Design an enzyme around this catalytic site. Sequence first.
Site, PDB file in Angstrom:
ATOM      1  N   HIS A   1       0.987  -1.144  -0.041  1.00 13.92           N
ATOM      2  CA  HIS A   1       0.089   0.046   0.021  1.00 13.92           C
ATOM      3  C   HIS A   1       0.832   1.145   0.090  1.00 13.92           C
ATOM      4  O   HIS A   1       0.154   2.455   0.091  1.00 13.92           O
ATOM      5  CB  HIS A   1      -0.989  -0.271   1.039  1.00 13.92           C
ATOM      6  CG  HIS A   1      -2.247  -1.213   0.876  1.00 13.92           C
ATOM      7  ND1 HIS A   1      -2.995  -1.746   1.828  1.00 13.92           N
ATOM      8  CD2 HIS A   1      -2.375  -1.736  -0.342  1.00 13.92           C
ATOM      9  CE1 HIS A   1      -3.772  -2.468   1.222  1.00 13.92           C
ATOM     10  NE2 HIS A   1      -3.561  -2.671   0.014  1.00 13.92           N
TER      11      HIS A   1
ATOM     12  N   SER B   1      -7.221  -8.316   9.201  1.00 14.51           N
ATOM     13  CA  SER B   1      -8.331  -8.971   9.182  1.00 14.51           C
ATOM     14  C   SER B   1      -8.554  -9.789   7.897  1.00 14.51           C
ATOM     15  O   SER B   1      -9.258 -10.907   7.658  1.00 14.51           O
ATOM     16  CB  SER B   1      -9.561  -7.947   9.111  1.00 14.51           C
ATOM     17  OG  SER B   1      -9.438  -7.121   7.937  1.00 14.51           O
TER      18      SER B   1
ATOM     19  N   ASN C   1      -3.034 -13.061  15.923  1.00 16.47           N
ATOM     20  CA  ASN C   1      -4.099 -12.025  16.079  1.00 16.47           C
ATOM     21  C   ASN C   1      -4.770 -12.077  17.282  1.00 16.47           C
ATOM     22  O   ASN C   1      -4.932 -13.182  17.776  1.00 16.47           O
ATOM     23  CB  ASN C   1      -5.033 -12.215  14.936  1.00 16.47           C
ATOM     24  CG  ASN C   1      -5.692 -10.993  14.602  1.00 16.47           C
ATOM     25  OD1 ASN C   1      -6.516 -10.516  15.285  1.00 16.47           O
ATOM     26  ND2 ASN C   1      -5.928 -10.443  13.445  1.00 16.47           N
TER      27      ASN C   1
ATOM     28  N   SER D   1      -7.871 -11.961  17.457  1.00 14.37           N
ATOM     29  CA  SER D   1      -9.110 -12.410  17.199  1.00 14.37           C
ATOM     30  C   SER D   1      -8.917 -13.245  15.900  1.00 14.37           C
ATOM     31  O   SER D   1      -8.225 -13.394  14.923  1.00 14.37           O
ATOM     32  CB  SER D   1     -10.264 -11.269  16.994  1.00 14.37           C
ATOM     33  OG  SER D   1     -11.150 -11.653  16.425  1.00 14.37           O
TER      34      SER D   1
ATOM     35  N   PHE E   1       0.482  -8.871  18.802  1.00 17.86           N
ATOM     36  CA  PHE E   1       1.811  -8.919  18.037  1.00 17.86           C
ATOM     37  C   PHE E   1       2.895  -9.017  18.856  1.00 17.86           C
ATOM     38  O   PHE E   1       4.037  -9.574  18.673  1.00 17.86           O
ATOM     39  CB  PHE E   1       1.640  -7.791  17.107  1.00 17.86           C
ATOM     40  CG  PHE E   1       2.979  -7.461  16.163  1.00 17.86           C
ATOM     41  CD1 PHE E   1       3.760  -8.604  15.409  1.00 17.86           C
ATOM     42  CD2 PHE E   1       3.383  -6.274  16.106  1.00 17.86           C
ATOM     43  CE1 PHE E   1       4.806  -8.277  14.771  1.00 17.86           C
ATOM     44  CE2 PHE E   1       4.823  -5.798  15.230  1.00 17.86           C
ATOM     45  CZ  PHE E   1       5.258  -7.083  14.619  1.00 17.86           C
TER      46      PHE E   1
HETATM   47  N1  LIG Z   1     -14.933  -0.034   6.339  1.00 18.38           N
HETATM   48  C1  LIG Z   1     -13.632   0.270   6.001  1.00 18.38           C
HETATM   49  O1  LIG Z   1     -12.972   1.359   5.466  1.00 18.38           O
HETATM   50  C2  LIG Z   1     -12.403  -0.757   6.508  1.00 18.38           C
HETATM   51  C3  LIG Z   1     -12.665  -2.295   6.362  1.00 18.38           C
HETATM   52  C4  LIG Z   1     -11.458  -2.970   6.506  1.00 18.38           C
HETATM   53  C5  LIG Z   1     -10.289  -2.524   6.437  1.00 18.38           C
HETATM   54  N2  LIG Z   1      -9.904  -1.271   6.338  1.00 18.38           N
HETATM   55  C6  LIG Z   1      -8.599  -0.425   6.633  1.00 18.38           C
HETATM   56  O2  LIG Z   1      -7.784  -1.349   5.550  1.00 18.38           O
HETATM   57  C7  LIG Z   1      -6.616  -1.484   5.809  1.00 18.38           C
HETATM   58  C8  LIG Z   1      -6.311  -2.832   5.707  1.00 18.38           C
HETATM   59  O3  LIG Z   1      -7.052  -3.850   6.721  1.00 18.38           O
HETATM   60  P1  LIG Z   1      -6.058  -4.298   8.087  1.00 18.38           P
HETATM   61  O4  LIG Z   1      -6.320  -5.839   7.822  1.00 18.38           O
HETATM   62  O5  LIG Z   1      -4.804  -3.854   8.136  1.00 18.38           O
HETATM   63  O6  LIG Z   1      -6.896  -3.484   9.175  1.00 18.38           O
HETATM   64  P2  LIG Z   1      -8.251  -4.049   9.845  1.00 18.38           P
HETATM   65  O7  LIG Z   1      -8.618  -2.795  10.767  1.00 18.38           O
HETATM   66  O8  LIG Z   1      -8.988  -4.883   9.001  1.00 18.38           O
HETATM   67  O9  LIG Z   1      -7.537  -5.130  10.937  1.00 18.38           O
HETATM   68  C9  LIG Z   1      -6.735  -5.046  12.081  1.00 18.38           C
HETATM   69  C10 LIG Z   1      -6.569  -6.486  12.527  1.00 18.38           C
HETATM   70  O10 LIG Z   1      -5.604  -6.460  13.525  1.00 18.38           O
HETATM   71  C11 LIG Z   1      -6.044  -7.300  14.650  1.00 18.38           C
HETATM   72  N3  LIG Z   1      -5.254  -6.435  15.768  1.00 18.38           N
HETATM   73  C12 LIG Z   1      -5.574  -5.426  16.609  1.00 18.38           C
HETATM   74  N4  LIG Z   1      -4.780  -5.325  17.387  1.00 18.38           N
HETATM   75  C13 LIG Z   1      -3.677  -6.365  17.474  1.00 18.38           C
HETATM   76  C14 LIG Z   1      -2.649  -6.483  18.264  1.00 18.38           C
HETATM   77  N5  LIG Z   1      -2.008  -5.749  18.955  1.00 18.38           N
HETATM   78  N6  LIG Z   1      -1.892  -7.824  17.863  1.00 18.38           N
HETATM   79  C15 LIG Z   1      -2.115  -8.575  16.858  1.00 18.38           C
HETATM   80  N7  LIG Z   1      -3.398  -8.499  16.052  1.00 18.38           N
HETATM   81  C16 LIG Z   1      -4.142  -7.056  16.240  1.00 18.38           C
HETATM   82  C17 LIG Z   1      -7.274  -7.069  14.772  1.00 18.38           C
HETATM   83  O11 LIG Z   1      -8.075  -7.945  15.762  1.00 18.38           O
HETATM   84  C18 LIG Z   1      -7.856  -7.182  13.085  1.00 18.38           C
HETATM   85  O12 LIG Z   1      -8.059  -8.469  12.981  1.00 18.38           O
HETATM   86  C19 LIG Z   1      -6.447  -0.809   7.054  1.00 18.38           C
HETATM   87  O13 LIG Z   1      -6.057   0.585   7.009  1.00 18.38           O
HETATM   88  C20 LIG Z   1      -7.982  -0.768   7.645  1.00 18.38           C
HETATM   89  O14 LIG Z   1      -8.359   0.163   8.702  1.00 18.38           O
HETATM   90  C21 LIG Z   1     -11.015  -0.211   6.381  1.00 18.38           C
END
Ligand SMILES: NC(=O)c1ccc[n+]([C@@H]2O[C@H](COP(=O)([O-])OP(=O)(O)OC[C@H]3O[C@@H](n4cnc5c(N)ncnc54)[C@H](O)[C@@H]3O)[C@@H](O)[C@H]2O)c1
EC number: 2.3.1.-
Lengths: 6, 263
Positions: free
Chosen positions: B123, B200, B224, B226, B243
């Site tokens: 990205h 996710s 993760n 979750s 992490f």
């Molecule tokens: N509706 C939307 O606009 C939307 C939907 C999905 C993703 N996104 C964005 O897209 C990009 C890519 O998705 P992504 O998957 O990187 O973000 P994501 O928000 O989809 O997920 C973050 C993930 O990290 C996990 N997580 C959180 N804290 C953690 C920790 N301390 N240690 C290990 N795991 C942890 C969460 O449980 C989740 O599965 C991001 O910038 C995200 O915000 C936006």
Amino acid sequence: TARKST
Amino acid sequence: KKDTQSITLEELAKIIKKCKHVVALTGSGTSAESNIPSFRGSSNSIWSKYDPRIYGTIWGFWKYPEKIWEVIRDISSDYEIEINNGHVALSTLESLGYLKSVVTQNVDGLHEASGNTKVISLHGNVFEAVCCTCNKIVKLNKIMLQKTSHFMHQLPPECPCGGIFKPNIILFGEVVSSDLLKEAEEEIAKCDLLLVIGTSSTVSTATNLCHFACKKKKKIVEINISKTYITNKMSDYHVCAKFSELTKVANILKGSSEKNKKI
Ligand SMILES: NC(=O)c1ccc[n+]([C@@H]2O[C@H](COP(=O)([O-])OP(=O)(O)OC[C@H]3O[C@@H](n4cnc5c(N)ncnc54)[C@H](O)[C@@H]3O)[C@@H](O)[C@H]2O)c1
Ligand SMILES: [Zn+2]
């Protein structure tokens, strides 16, 4: 197409 | 569909000890413990100030090109942002000769800051910007993204040619670099393990890479807090952990390597 999308 | 099974950190260390080409796929979860909340609906965070429909999309960039800069400026200026123990852990796993590349959806540059050497930025990366008329590249650094910087004084930043600067990050609705994708695909084709950490796997970029890994029949382990979209669909195992708890895996494998002592 490797479009960034949800 | 796959019957994903839960495993411990020590069981993960055990899996890694046998591997020759480990790849990591990372998302915002790995910067979570670097003071950037992953949950974007959190009302007590930076994301509350900003409408994602604007700063996060290419339509949003052309209508309001100052916003993604404001976002980058605020996160950079208002929060303390350092590598966490996950990063140091991933850095030692490369040192010990297990981890060969980190394919990331994060744009913050923290993996490289920790010493990782083959970070594939699907990205893009907040430390580069491009004039979206003449394509001039400007290299940035943390100090340039501060609110007090001259570069940040007028937003969007302006190019001598008359165009404006756009961060070198892929926004929603933009297309990921097809040479970078091919790089990430050739890493996964050669790996013997894929760690999918702090994501996710619902963004196309991640989902498609994980599909690709199943296609090439790679062993897939989630780390993760979750379960995720790929649990019981694509991953073979899942470590329920932050992490930063990866230092335990790194400590096991590091200890074991110290078998350099004759006897
Ligand atoms: N509706 C939307 O606009 C939307 C939907 C999905 C993703 N996104 C964005 O897209 C990009 C890519 O998705 P992504 O998957 O990187 O973000 P994501 O928000 O989809 O997920 C973050 C993930 O990290 C996990 N997580 C959180 N804290 C953690 C920790 N301390 N240690 C290990 N795991 C942890 C969460 O449980 C989740 O599965 C991001 O910038 C995200 O915000 C936006
Ligand atoms: Zn220009």
